[PDB]
Design a protein around this ligand. Structure first.
Ligand code: ADP
Ligand code: MG
Lengths: 473, 51, 57, 506, 89, 85
């Protein structure tokens, strides 16, 4: 192949203009590497100005850039290393591992801007993945290839919930995971990496469960925009190589969309006055099109959107439930009661929770559980106000069954064995349904309420009941 | 069964596409240039003469 | 035949003077009502027993 | 298989014939690309709004014709095209396949089959940009459109040919009411009378592919895909696709309209179409007019929605009923794009977010939702019962606001207030539940005629179901008479009065 | 031209020994000759319900029951309950 | 919005308590420290836990200022503790 090269003509802040020769002009969304003393810098093309010049956006700071600097063309989009060697490694937007653990020994480099699948290949089949935690897989079951998400605050256990989700997917589905760092605070990123290491799920000398792609937002906006793209590429390569229902973890859609809007603003686009963002339509749509279900595997993105003080400003974070197929809210109220999974069963709804989607018995159990919880809170109001006496025997039955269900929602996490020392368990979807329905009819009413606490599965419920009746009672 | 047969047709179509691209790559290696160059040069000459 | 039966049943229901304080005849009333609803559902949703191989095969 | 071989041979023979005929009749060299707009040299005598073939394969069209350079907006991803690429022109204005074969098929803005169900069989090709019919070809809207919402959509109707707007915030029910109307049209398009069939066509512009896949799945679940066209441009493709998809849907709608048939078109969320035009104009060197919006947004809405009209008997008496949808931010109907589209349409349907959060699933505000077919272009049975009920409900809302202002002869002591609150609670509906026009008159008649004074607001929901069951079980006589006649006469009014004050005691 | 015969022989040789004729596979290593009619024969079967809905199980449900030939006992029970309901009228 | 997104939590200030008399106008409801608990001296961290609930309850029940005399004893006590704090 001919040695394609260019010359830098303009550096519009992050934007860099490079002049190529005839037929040597690369297309847009094409990486352009420049050798720099502080490492390696590449630039993707977004606009063709003309006269053999292409406008590009840098993935890192353009410090020390000089006109006439040689620009090498990779040949296609920003290729990033892919494979099992990327698991448990901090890899930036460009692809160079920034974990200070050495180079990534990956045999393949799939371009980030891969061709999205066709409409005829868009599988509309709706089936529910088994996660490993009863509350999520029953109350708000996760759609396969859809757009599910986490909406929790700080200190409620969102990060540890991510850890449990990725561990359970690695052990139950046998599929790896990816977490993206678009618009990340480097402090919370370092804290998340430390927790990831200390949970013993990414064995540095052994097997790693999450390919933690990570891009700092102190970098120019293009890096934030394309870190989601390279995380998508890693997830897609895992899906298309291994028969795994891998799950993808976007740390925030809002950060990606704001990065895209400022990328457009630099490129020459503009939003509407007084504040409104319609520009994201191309990038947001392409990102959605990169998360579908294929014949061999699937990718289930998680939209772990942090609550912005109960005020979603940009249109994409505004009313996320339109894009959401299974909402998983992590409220502080449930964690105040001591239930380790912060999933609020009442507010955690799923669009796939239907009779013809998850199952007749699954839908019946979920609906009965939701109704029992609603009656539980409604009668809890009068229990707190007028006392427990002002309550009927049928109301007593409903309250006790729903309380047993709520205390049953607390189940161990396999990643919390160092955080609080609990024997983490991986429940089964059939076992989850069986245990929940068994609690539902009331055949386990004689079981003590403390037995329902801190257990997973009805067998563990009776085990804890007999332990309590053998040690304390 | 009808949608399974439709999926069968779709996978047959994509397998045909893979075969076509593989044969295109094969043609990219074999000496198949001079004869086609003469052929469509004559074709363009006839196109010019026809007008 | 069902029209006259419905007429007389509804007239009896609305003309109850010494036919109040009931516990099971209303239950049979809803039984008949849901039976008729199932009848109507079956007639409107009559799937084709034989396979329509004339146009489907 | 056998068909691909012969198809390929025939089409490549036609390709060789085209290449050997008239050279290519014009070409060009790409000067710039980006965001789906491409500058190109050459094309000296290119037609306006003309399709162009690119060497890579991406389609194009000419919004701008500068001296020397030509403004081409790219129909698809701009990644494939590069500098210096040869740009062949197709020789014709931008067209889209139109015909009866598009029924049951999903296509893109250009009309190419995207559902993967096979080739599209079209009677002809119609220009995406077609002048709207004139005054005389247009006809007064008189034929009703059965919305099937059992709400204000019935008391103040839509009718065949109206461009009734659906305003409101996101996730308020605009797509919901659109799909309920599409489902309700099945009862009339499943017959043989072509004068009453409503061949729907959906415009899922600016809609994620998962959402449109779920929408088409729901359509074919209810056997609604047989008469609905899903010509659309999702968020995956470029902005020009979004800009042109509603116009090609309009072309299909006129083809149905110009052939004497009746078609319902729902321009779902035109906001992304407007912002796609913004994206074109920003880098096509057209300065924005107002509020960062190019001025021609109002004009494009005008040409697109005024094509929707009811043709006269001379032109075939066809109808092109339109259901435009706009996604406003925070209920701001005074914003620019709202103002233009509320001034472009024949009335609107407001869907505020507060009503949706309150519990009313239709979430329609009676006060501002107006139309130009008040007690007209209706069945007739509903038009006599509630020909002016919207004004009464608006006055009820004003007095209820006035009632809370000060303690006077108001609240439950006001018959107008009681009737208004009962009617507002009456006007409710669940999604995927198309209700026919026959099972809508008795409820509104009970509401309007003051028969709901002693039924209580909380019990109106049960009263609706009980009254409908009453009609459909032991009073089907007058119900079927209304359905077949399409009007309530003195006999039918007397029978409905009999039923309503016989069932008022329950 | 050259393509006019080259692509037709391309789409008439490999598709011939790819499907329809159903014999051998020259262009690519994985064979779909025993894949689509044999391995994919249970494809929709796996996707749908097997041995229940594909075979249309002739589930002979229990016939509708009745009062089990209840004697005059239920008659006078009905008499008694009607009498005690009507006594307070 | 950019600044609050990059910063790991913010401390809101308003001129309205600055004018009423609370010159250190730090409002807990909109202020938040995402790592403040992990980086706070232990004594205040253990004692400030009760402060948060007290002032939050006071601020939410602060809508009816001249009404707690006969509204509820708990509301009156919450108002008293909140204004003391
Ligand atoms: N009875 C109902 N009527 C209307 N919408 C309902 C009803 N029940 C639930 N919904 C929800 O309301 C949503 C309607 O959103 P939609 O109007 O399609 O959004 P947009 O306005 O952005 O198109 C649906 O996703 C559906 O889940
Ligand atoms: Mg929608």
């Amino acid at each position: 192949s001919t040695p394609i090269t260019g010359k830098v003509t303009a550096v519009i802040g992050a934007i860099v203009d490079v002049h190529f020769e005839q037929s040597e002009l690369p297309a847009i969304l094409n990486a352009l590497e420049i050798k720099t003393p502080q490492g390696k810098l590449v630039l993707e093309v977004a606009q063709h100005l003309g006269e053999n010049t292409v406008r590009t956006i840098a993935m890192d700071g353009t410090e020390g850039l000089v006109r006439g600097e040689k620009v090498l063309d990779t040949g296609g989009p920003i290729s990033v290393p892919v494979g099992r060697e990327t698991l448990g490694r901090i890899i930036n937007v460009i692809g160079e591992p920034i974990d200070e653990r050495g180079p990534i020994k990956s045999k393949l480099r799939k371009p980030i801007h891969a061709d999205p699948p066709s409409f005829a290949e868009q599988s509309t089949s709706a089936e529910i993945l088994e996660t490993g935690i009863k509350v999520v897989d029953l109350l708000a079951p996760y759609a396969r290839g859809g757009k599910i998400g986490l909406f929790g605050g700080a200190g409620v256990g969102k990060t540890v919930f991510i850890q449990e989700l990725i561990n359970n997917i690695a052990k139950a589905h046998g599929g790896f995971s990816v977490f993206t760092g678009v618009g990340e605070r480097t402090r919370e990123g370092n804290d998340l990496y430390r927790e990831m290491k200390e949970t013993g799920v990414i064995n540095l000398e052994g097997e790693s469960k999450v390919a933690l792609v990570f891009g700092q937002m102190n970098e120019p906006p293009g890096a934030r925009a394309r870190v989601a793209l390279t995380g998508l590429t890693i997830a897609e390569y895992f899906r298309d190589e291994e028969g795994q229902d891998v799950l993808l973890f976007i740390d925030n859609i809002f950060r990606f969309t704001q990065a895209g809007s400022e990328v457009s603003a630099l490129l020459g686009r503009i939003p509407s006055a007084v504040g409104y963002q319609p520009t994201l339509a191309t990038d947001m749509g392409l990102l959605q099109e990169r998360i579908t279900t294929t014949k061999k595997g699937s990718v289930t993105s998680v939209q772990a959107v942090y609550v912005p003080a109960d005020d979603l400003t940009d249109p994409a974070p505004a009313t996320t439930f339109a894009h959401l197929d299974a909402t998983t809210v992590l409220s502080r109220g449930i964690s105040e009661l001591g239930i380790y999974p912060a999933v609020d069963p009442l507010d955690s709804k799923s669009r796939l929770l239907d009779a013809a989607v998850v199952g007749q018995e699954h839908y019946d159990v979920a609906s009965k559980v939701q109704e029992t919880l609603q009656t539980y809170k409604s009668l809890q109001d009068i229990i707190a106000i007028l006392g427990m006496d002002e309550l009927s025997e049928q109301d007593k039955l409903t309250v006790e069954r729903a309380r047993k269900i709520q205390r049953f929602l607390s189940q161990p996490f396999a990643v919390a064995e160092v955080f609080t020392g609990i024997p983490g368990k991986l429940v089964r979807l059939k076992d989850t349904v069986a245990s929940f329905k068994a609690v539902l009819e009331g055949k386990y009413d004689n079981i003590p309420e403390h037995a329902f606490y801190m257990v997973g599965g009805i067998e563990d419920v009776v085990a804890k009941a007999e332990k309590l009746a053998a040690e304390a009672n | 069964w009808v949608r399974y047969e439709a999926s069968l047709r779709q996978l047959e179509q994509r397998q045909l596409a893979k075969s076509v691209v593989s044969r295109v790559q094969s043609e990219l290696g074999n000496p198949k240039f001079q004869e086609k160059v003469l052929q469509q040069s004559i074709s363009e000459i006839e196109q010019l003469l026809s007008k | 035949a069902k029209s006259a039966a419905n007429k007389l049943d509804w007239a009896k229901v609305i003309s109850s003077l010494r036919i109040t304080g009931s516990t099971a005849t209303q239950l049979s009333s809803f039984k008949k009502r849901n039976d008729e609803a199932r009848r109507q559902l079956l007639e409107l949703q009559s799937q084709p027993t034989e396979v329509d191989f004339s146009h489907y095969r | 298989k056998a068909q691909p071989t012969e198809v390929s041979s025939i089409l490549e023979e036609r390709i060789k014939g085209v290449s050997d005929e008239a050279n290519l009749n014009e070409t060009g060299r790409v000067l710039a690309v980006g965001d789906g707009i491409a500058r190109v040299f050459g094309l000296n005598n290119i037609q306006a709004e003309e399709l162009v073939e690119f060497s890579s394969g991406v389609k194009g069209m000419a919004l701008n014709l500068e001296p020397g350079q030509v403004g081409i907006v790219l129909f698809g991803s701009d990644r494939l095209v590069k500098e210096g690429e040869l740009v062949k022109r197709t020789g014709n204005i931008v067209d889209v396949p139109v015909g009866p074969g598009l029924l049951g098929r999903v296509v893109d803005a250009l009309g190419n089959p995207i559902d993967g169900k096979g080739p599209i069989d079209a009677a002809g090709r119609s220009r995406a940009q077609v002048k709207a019919p004139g005054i005389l070809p247009r006809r007064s809207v008189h034929e009703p459109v059965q919305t099937g919402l059992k709400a204000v959509d019935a008391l103040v109707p839509i009718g065949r040919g109206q461009r009734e707007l659906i305003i409101g915030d996101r996730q308020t029910g605009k797509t919901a009411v659109a799909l309920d109307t599409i489902l309700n049209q099945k009862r009339w398009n499943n017959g043989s009378d072509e004068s009453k069939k409503l061949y729907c066509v959906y415009v899922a512009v600016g809609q994620k592919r998962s959402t449109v896949a779920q929408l088409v799945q729901t359509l074919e679940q209810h056997d609604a895909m047989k008469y609905s066209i899903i010509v659309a441009a999702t968020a995956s493709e470029a902005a020009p696709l979004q800009y042109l998809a509603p116009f090609t849907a309009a072309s299909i709608g006129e083809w149905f309209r110009d052939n004497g048939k009746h078609a319902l078109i729902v321009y779902d969320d035109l906001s992304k179409q407007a912002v796609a035009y913004r994206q074109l104009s920003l880098l096509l060197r057209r300065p924005p007019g107002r509020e960062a919006y190019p001025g021609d947004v109002f004009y494009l809405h005008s040409r697109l929605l005024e094509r929707a009209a009811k043709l006269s008997e001379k032109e075939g008496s066809g109808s092109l009923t339109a259901l435009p949808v706009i996604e406003t931010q925070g209920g701001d109907v005074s914003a620019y794009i709202p103002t233009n589209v509320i001034s472009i349409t024949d009335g609107q349907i407001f869907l505020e977010a507060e009503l949706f959060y309150k519990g009313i699933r239709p979430a329609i505000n009676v006060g501002l939702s107006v139309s130009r077919v008040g007690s007209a272009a209706q069945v007739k049975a509903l038009k006599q019962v509630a020909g002016s009920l919207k004004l009464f409900l608006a006055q009820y809302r004003e007095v209820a606001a006035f009632a809370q202002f000060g303690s006077d002869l108001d609240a439950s002591t006001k018959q107008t207030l009681v009737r208004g609150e009962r009617l507002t609670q009456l006007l409710k509906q669940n999604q995927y539940s198309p209700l026919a026009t026959e099972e809508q008159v008795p409820l509104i008649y009970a509401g309007v005629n003051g028969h709901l004074d002693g039924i209580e607001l909380s019990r109106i929901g049960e009263f609706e179901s009980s009254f409908l069951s009453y009609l459909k079980s032991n009073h089907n006589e007058l119900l079927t008479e209304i359905r077949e006649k399409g009007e309530l006469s003195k006999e039918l009014l007397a029978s409905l009065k009999s039923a309503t004050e016989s069932f008022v005691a329950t | 031209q050259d393509l006019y015969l080259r692509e037709l022989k391309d789409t008439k040789l490999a598709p011939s020994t790819l499907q329809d004729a159903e014999g051998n596979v020259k262009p690519w290593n994985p064979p779909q000759k025993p894949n689509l009619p044999e391995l994919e024969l249970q494809g929709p079967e796996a996707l749908k319900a097997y041995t229940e809905q594909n075979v249309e199980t002739a589930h002979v449900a229990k016939e509708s029951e009745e009062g089990e030939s209840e004697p005059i006992e239920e008659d006078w029970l009905v008499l008694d309950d009607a009498e005690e309901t009507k006594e307070s009228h």
